[PDB]
Design a protein around this ligand. Structure first.
Ligand SMILES: [Cl-]
Ligand SMILES: [Cl-]
Ligand SMILES: [Cl-]
Ligand SMILES: [Cl-]
Ligand SMILES: [Cl-]
Ligand SMILES: [Mn+2]
Ligand SMILES: [Mn+2]
Ligand SMILES: [Mn+2]
Ligand SMILES: [Mn+2]
Length: 502
């Protein structure tokens, strides 16, 4: 819903916590806020939701910004929740002075169960000036102040657990804030800060994953009680996948235990990781647009996302060939000579926009051991993109065959790929095939870790693959889809298999 949205006057905002790397969960949010803003020719704010102190190992803002650019999402302005602390304090005092907030020194268990059973706590009827004295205590971070929090005074008998005096401010004196250090001793809560900040920042349409509770009634109460400009708020379903560890504790465990090497490892749910695994932002965004709502708590399968991605990339990438380097066996076309013939072929047989490549042939070829051990004497097979041959004797250590290129491809059922036996021009490559880090769909947990989830293979590839640049995607004939990840000394390629949904 873009309720009462007006063309040219919509402002949304994407509000990630600046305390971690962007991961695919953020995906939906980042896109939908951009989607709706473009639908209405409006603006999308980027607000780092730094409302409470969190110990950070790195300033994550740069990472988030870079990933957002890598998704084509552009935003009008960048703010911090923390930029409104002074304003938020002002409003908190106004709340106290309208008798719509009180200080409460009741304990956490007691408070939780009085909210459960609906008992208004003793302090609910404090005087305004007592509430003010206590709030200043919190602002100062004294003993008393740390004993206290500020709650909204709504309705403890309400049907909705979120309207029974939610907490608005808290006193945190020991954890530093990633921007203001220990300058603030009290901090607003998410529930109090979000409506206020959206309102004063110009947001017309706040978008939020459904948290299964009716925070909406609360949001709205805050906005009306304070007499602020109204913000519409639409809840959409969270996007989460199976076999995906999204918990920072367990992610850090992986990283510090050398199960992965960085937070950008392709088995990780970070945006950098999944792009590195070969996903297109087009695929992800179309997946989001096409998936509809999801019951709170449901996890999606990866297969549809990768199938979308395959349909996207299949028509716009070159097709090259590669064989297993240590097990490839030699096939000799005994009627030809070792003169090296070079023919122009098309990089895509059905998309000449990608252009041409050079193909080399000789009397000597490299074919797959599986393909090889499938052959039979006097069997006429097809070297793809080249022509047909008839096998003579399967010596498997060698295969001898005779050329017959001018015959038709129709009468042939076996159509194998190949590499010209030119070791000084064949390109050596490492293929990485990744698997999920956990064996289960959701959560003694480390006993479900797939430790051997990075399979490496050495292959030879056509010389023309040298033309590829880092991050290029392509297809290996009868092998699958890959993305160039790294170029090494002596043009050794590191290639990551892109899942295809099958
Ligand atoms: Cl609470
Ligand atoms: Cl939804
Ligand atoms: Cl955690
Ligand atoms: Cl790595
Ligand atoms: Cl086949
Ligand atoms: Mn920071
Ligand atoms: Mn010769
Ligand atoms: Mn010929
Ligand atoms: Mn495996």
């Amino acid at each position: 819903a873009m309720a009462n949205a007006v063309i040219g006057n919509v402002v949304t905002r994407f509000p990630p916590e600046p305390s971690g790397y962007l991961h695919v969960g953020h995906a939906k949010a980042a896109f939908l806020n951009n989607y709706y803003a473009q639908m209405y020719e409006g603006k999308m704010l980027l607000r780092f939701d730094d409302t409470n102190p969190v110990l950070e190992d790195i300033k994550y803002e740069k990472s988030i910004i870079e990933d957002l650019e890598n998704l084509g999402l552009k935003y009008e302005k960048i703010s911090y929740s923390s930029d409104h602390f002074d304003l938020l304090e002002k409003y908190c005092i106004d709340m106290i002075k309208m008798n719509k907030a009180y200080a409460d020194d009741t304990g956490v268990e007691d408070m939780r169960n009085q909210r459960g059973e609906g008992i208004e706590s003793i302090n609910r009827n404090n005087s305004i000036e007592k509430n003010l004295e206590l709030f200043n205590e919190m602002r100062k971070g004294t003993e008393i102040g740390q004993k206290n929090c500020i709650r909204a005074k709504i309705n403890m008998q309400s049907k909705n657990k979120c309207m029974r005096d939610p907490v608005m401010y808290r006193c945190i004196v020991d954890v530093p804030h990633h921007k203001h250090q220990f300058k603030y001793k009290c901090y607003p809560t998410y529930d109090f800060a979000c409506p206020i900040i959206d309102s004063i920042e110009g947001v017309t349409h706040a978008l939020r994953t459904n948290e299964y509770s009716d925070r909406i009634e609360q949001y709205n109460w805050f906005i009306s009680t304070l007499n602020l400009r109204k913000v519409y708020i639409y809840e959409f379903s969270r996007l989460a996948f199976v076999k995906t560890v999204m918990s920072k504790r367990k992610l850090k465990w992986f990283v510090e235990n050398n199960v992965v090497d960085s937070w950008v490892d392709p088995r990780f749910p970070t945006i950098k990781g999944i792009l590195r695994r070969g996903l297109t932002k087009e695929a992800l965004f179309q997946f989001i647009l096409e998936q509809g709502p999801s019951k709170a708590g449901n996890l999606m399968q990866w297969d549809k996302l990768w199938s979308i991605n395959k349909q996207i990339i299949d028509p716009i990438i070159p097709r090259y060939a590669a064989v297993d380097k240590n097990s490839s066996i030699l096939l000799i076309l005994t009627d030809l000579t070792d003169q090296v013939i070079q023919k122009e072929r098309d990089l895509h047989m059905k998309n000449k926009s990608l252009g041409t490549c050079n193909m080399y042939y000789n009397n000597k070829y490299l074919i797959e051991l599986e393909d090889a051990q499938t052959l039979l004497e006097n069997e006429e097979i097809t070297l793809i993109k080249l022509g047909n041959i008839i096998i003579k004797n399967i010596e498997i250590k060698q295969i001898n065959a005779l050329s017959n290129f001018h015959g038709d491809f129709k009468t042939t059922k076996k159509k194998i790929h190949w590499l010209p036996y030119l070791p000084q021009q064949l390109i050596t490559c490492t293929l990485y095939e990744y698997d999920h880090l956990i064996t289960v769909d959701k959560f003694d947990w480390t006993n479900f870790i797939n430790f051997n989830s990075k399979h490496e293979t050495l292959v030879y590839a056509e010389p023309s693959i040298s033309s590829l640049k880092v991050s290029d995607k392509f297809q290996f004939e009868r092998r699958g889809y890959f993305i160039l990840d790294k170029i090494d000394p002596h043009h050794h390629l590191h290639l990551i298999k892109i899942p295809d949904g099958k």
